[PDB]
């Protein structure tokens, strides 16, 4: 086509469009020329960079601070040979529907930041080198679907062109952004707006479907006030993340030839473990942090200011955090009820450089008030909504409430938040950052010394702003669990406000984690895993949100049984009693067939090598959370596991499980719908009951 | 050519909640569009509300932000202004009037009506 | 948000003299008209853009704009250009007046 279809009849209209699912948008159009012989410099990706970027002095980042739209999308839209497309699609909130040329005058300023600093070439060699970058390092490919995309370009392209497809750059082309700048102007815009509420209103139809529409052009006062006045406000081209990347290498084994990470340092400060990769090569690095320090379970205050820290330095580091994180490193901030989580992943280049800022950027910490009014109104909205949650989630939080030491309620946390002032918690930030404890988990193709003298200035830089020292090592205490008087079969009720359901989850201690205990476990869970697949939801049929097994807290095991539903709690529990049965005399009726189907069935469902040097790692993170170090443990649970008998799950069941039982350690909570002992005072009740021993460290 | 009919604002007590018709026949709201403005009597001017009838959009100013609530009929070319909070600081004049073609060109008018919240 | 500061409240002068009336804005833009309003009237735009002269007005009317000065000029005044005017600044931002300018005589 020599001529885009849109000729001037069609430019400067709205839309109205009535959809059947409730949803709102707002649809922004430009047609612009052909720039495909220009894929030397891609202007219309790099507007796609532009307008889809989130950083300092973006447009959707006061769009955000206006509250006005949740998400947009820009960029180059293909269309035919001849023309091509420039679309811009927005979702809607309430009052966004009151501000659209507000909206599309910020869309102008935006526009207008481009027109007054002109073109940028820093912006177009970082995204060059990004993209490069990128493209070197790809991950897969579907084998099919590939070939019909690249299949789809193997018409436009030469045979060099057909994998460095739109992944490699040439030449700047400042003309053709003066080209699309002249290409973005109010003459050119085609509106298009979604909303439910638009019923009565649109009577131009649709030819093939039916839908209803509207031409309904902008006056030109709207328009005329666009070009001519044009200022600046807020907004600010966003900077640079360039940071060394240029060591990708993979560095080769040393004579420290383990398969499992090595606790390369210990002090009283921190305590160092190190692995480098041996089976993916990748140029890949994955960091996992925790700080340990007193001061976060001492009380609800405590947590509630901790909780305040981390979130608003979330909210204080994404700002500055997101563009970095756009270059392929990311990251995760989270809480223990311990200490603090830090995730750090991503490539060898400038974990360093950006690590080493993170620490200097948390390290000096401030407050803004109408944020901290914000931030605590929204997880106070978060706190008192916890009565409107699902059961399951519920019965969890009930079942680590009751199996712990001490645990804080919700309500007393809701209580608590009329008390959070700034001077409080700028009292207590510089208390808690004083006093901790590190551990840090590196792997990846890194060395052991690099490590040890980065850590080693991440600890001292630590000591350099507050004069940090370290924890005393009587004081790395754990909370224990509960030991149940051996016989006790124990429940209570709890009465949910909003959901009309019942969850329900059905506690048992076994035993700590020894080596026979977790195959004991994980075998008899699975065995009385799929006949409840076969008899729970069909035959039974007690909900759609059923659930047993394991239990992984303390270094002790547990056996459980989450069930959401609207029921009768001892209707319910009878019937999980039946399944008890039915799983007892499906012990004694097993065949070798059921036997050895089923421990490959186990086999099969622990064997698995890693994938990602982040499963791995999360596993092995996994592993140091709950202090046990038993890299090994795979290999040697495997090795008993093929070790049991049918009479050995047997022995393993009648002392804890069955009515006659002198092990039996059975408890369950009771949550109900909108609609043994007793348990009146939870402190009074724990205050006459033991607790359980740790696990020796390895 | 320009017809700005303004009419129904009367004389009430505080905690009510009325609309306020603007009949605008020569033009089309969905043109050049129309605008409120506060005018008390013996002080200055205020503009109140604008309404876009073509895109919806309502703009308020910073005092009576959210308290009123502006609406438009294109089918008739005809909009409104429904008004809550209703305080003693409301006895005034008010104004119907056609922004044209211009940055800051609000050139016709109405006659006007008297709204007044009283003691 | 940008407020205007309407200089003067009123002022005085005859029939045939050059009235200069400045406005001024709260910050460095641009978008700013003229009124004029006998009372118990509807008002008049007088100057559209701060410089131009809206048609049907008198030619004795003109706007100048001086970087934040934002200036209304009568060259000449007459009998019945004796009226209330007043600036106005108009953005998507909410739009605020002035007090009022009253034309008054020399004796």
């Known amino acids: 086509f020599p001529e885009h279809p849109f000729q001037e009849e069609h430019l400067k209209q709205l839309y109205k469009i009535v959809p059947i699912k409730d949803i709102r948008n707002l649809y922004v159009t430009f047609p612009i020329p052909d720039l495909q012989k220009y894929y030397k410099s891609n202007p219309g990706h790099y507007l796609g960079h532009l307008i889809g970027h989130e950083g300092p002095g973006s447009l959707l980042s006061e769009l955000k601070s206006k509250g006005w739209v949740n998400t947009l999308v820009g960029g180059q839209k293909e269309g035919a040979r001849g023309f091509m497309f420039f679309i811009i699609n927005v979702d809607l909130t309430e009052e966004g529907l009151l501000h659209v040329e507000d909206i599309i005058l910020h869309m102008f300023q935006y526009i207008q930041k481009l027109r007054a600093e002109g073109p940028q070439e820093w912006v177009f060699q970082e995204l060059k080198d990004l993209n490069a970058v990128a493209f070197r390092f790809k991950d897969k490919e579907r084998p099919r679907g590939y070939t019909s995309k690249i299949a789809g370009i193997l018409h436009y392209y030469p045979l060099e062109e057909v994998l460095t497809a739109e992944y490699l750059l040439e030449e700047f082309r400042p003309d053709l952004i003066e080209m699309v700048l002249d290409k973005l102007r109010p003459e050119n815009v085609r509106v298009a707006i979604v909303s439910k509420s638009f019923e009565g209103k649109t009577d131009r139809t649709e030819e093939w479907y039916g839908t209803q529409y509207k031409q309904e052009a902008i006056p030109d006062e709207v328009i005329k006030k666009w070009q001519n006045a044009d200022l600046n406000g807020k907004f600010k081209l966003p900077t640079k993340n360039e940071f060394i990347p240029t060591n990708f290498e993979i560095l080769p084994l040393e004579k420290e030839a383990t398969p499992y990470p090595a606790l390369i340092k210990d002090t009283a400060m921190s305590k160092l473990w190190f692995k480098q990769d041996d089976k993916f090569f990748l140029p890949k690095a994955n960091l996992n942090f925790e700080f340990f320090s007193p001061f976060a379970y001492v009380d609800p205050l405590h947590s509630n200011m901790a909780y305040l820290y981390l979130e608003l330095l979330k909210d204080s580091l994404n700002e500055y955090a997101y563009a970095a994180e756009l270059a392929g490193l990311s990251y995760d901030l989270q809480n223990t009820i311990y200490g603090m989580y830090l995730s750090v992943k991503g490539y060898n280049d400038k974990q360093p450089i950006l690590l080493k800022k993170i620490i200097e950027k948390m390290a000096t910490f401030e407050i803004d008030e109408k944020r901290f009014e914000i931030i605590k109104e929204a997880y106070m909205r978060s706190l008192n909504n916890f009565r409107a949650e699902q059961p399951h989630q519920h019965a969890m939080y009930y079942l680590r409430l009751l199996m712990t030491e001490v645990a804080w309620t919700k309500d007393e946390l809701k209580e608590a938040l009329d008390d959070v002032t700034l001077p409080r918690l700028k009292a207590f930030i510089p208390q808690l950052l004083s006093r901790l404890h590190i551990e840090a988990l590196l792997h990846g193709n890194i060395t052991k010394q690099a490590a040890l003298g980065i850590m080693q200035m991440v600890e001292d830089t630590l000591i350099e702003h507050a004069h940090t020292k370290p924890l005393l090592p009587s004081q790395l205490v754990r909370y224990r669990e509960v030991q149940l008087p051996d016989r006790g079969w124990f429940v209570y009720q709890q009465r949910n406000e909003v959901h009309n359901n019942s969850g329900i989850e059905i506690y048992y201690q076994t035993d700590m984690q020894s080596t026979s205990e977790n195959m004991f476990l994980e075998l008899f869970a699975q065995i009385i895993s799929e006949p409840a697949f076969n008899t729970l939801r069909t035959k039974e049929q007690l909900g759609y949100i059923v659930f047993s097994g394991p239990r992984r807290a303390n270094g002790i095991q547990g056996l459980r049984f989450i069930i959401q539903s609207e029921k009768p709690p001892h209707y319910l529990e009878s019937r999980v009693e039946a399944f008890l049965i039915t799983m007892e005399k499906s012990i004694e009726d097993m065949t070798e067939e059921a036997f050895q189907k089923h421990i490959q069935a186990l086999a099969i469902r622990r064997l698995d090598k890693p994938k990602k040097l982040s499963a791995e790692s999360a596993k092995y993170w996994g592993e140091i959370i709950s202090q046990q170090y038993n890299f090994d443990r795979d290999n040697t649970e495997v090795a008993y596991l093929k070790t049991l008998t049918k009479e050995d799950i047997i022995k393993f069941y009648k002392e804890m499980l069955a009515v006659d039982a002198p092990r039996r350690h059975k408890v369950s909570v009771h949550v109900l719908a909108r609609e043994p002992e007793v348990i009146q005072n939870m402190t009074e009740f724990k205050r006459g009951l033991p607790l359980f021993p740790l696990v020796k460290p390895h | 050519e320009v017809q700005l009919v303004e009419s129904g604002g009367g004389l009430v007590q505080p905690g009510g909640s009325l609309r306020l018709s603007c009949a605008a026949s020569?033009?089309?709201?969905?043109?050049?569009?129309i605008h409120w403005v506060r005018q008390a009597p013996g002080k200055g001017l205020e503009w109140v509300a604008s309404?876009?009838?073509?895109?919806?959009?309502?703009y308020y100013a910073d005092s009576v932000k959210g308290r009123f609530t502006i609406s438009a009929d294109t089918s008739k070319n005809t909009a409104y202004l429904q008004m809550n909070s209703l305080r003693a600081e409301d006895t005034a004049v008010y104004y119907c009037?056609?922004?044209?073609?211009?940055?800051?060109?609000?050139?016709?008018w109405g006659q006007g009506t008297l709204v007044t919240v009283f003691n | 948000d940008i407020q205007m500061t309407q200089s003067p409240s009123s002022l005085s002068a005859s029939v045939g003299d050059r009235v200069t009336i400045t406005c001024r804005a709260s910050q460095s833009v641009s978008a700013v008209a003229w009124y004029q309003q006998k009372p118990g009237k509807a008002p008049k735009l007088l100057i559209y853009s701060a410089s131009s002269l809206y048609s049907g007005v008198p030619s004795r009317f003109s706007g100048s704009r001086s970087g934040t000065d934002y200036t209304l000029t009568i060259s000449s005044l007459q009998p019945e250009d004796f009226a209330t005017y007043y600036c106005?600044?108009?953005?998507?931002?909410?739009?605020?007046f002035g007090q009022g300018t009253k034309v008054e005589i020399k004796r």
């Open positions: 020569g033009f089309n709201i969905s043109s050049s569009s």
């Open positions: 106005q600044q108009s953005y998507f931002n909410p739009i605020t």
């Open positions: 009037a056609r922004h044209y073609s211009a940055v800051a060109g609000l050139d016709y």
């Open positions: 309404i876009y009838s073509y895109s919806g959009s309502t």
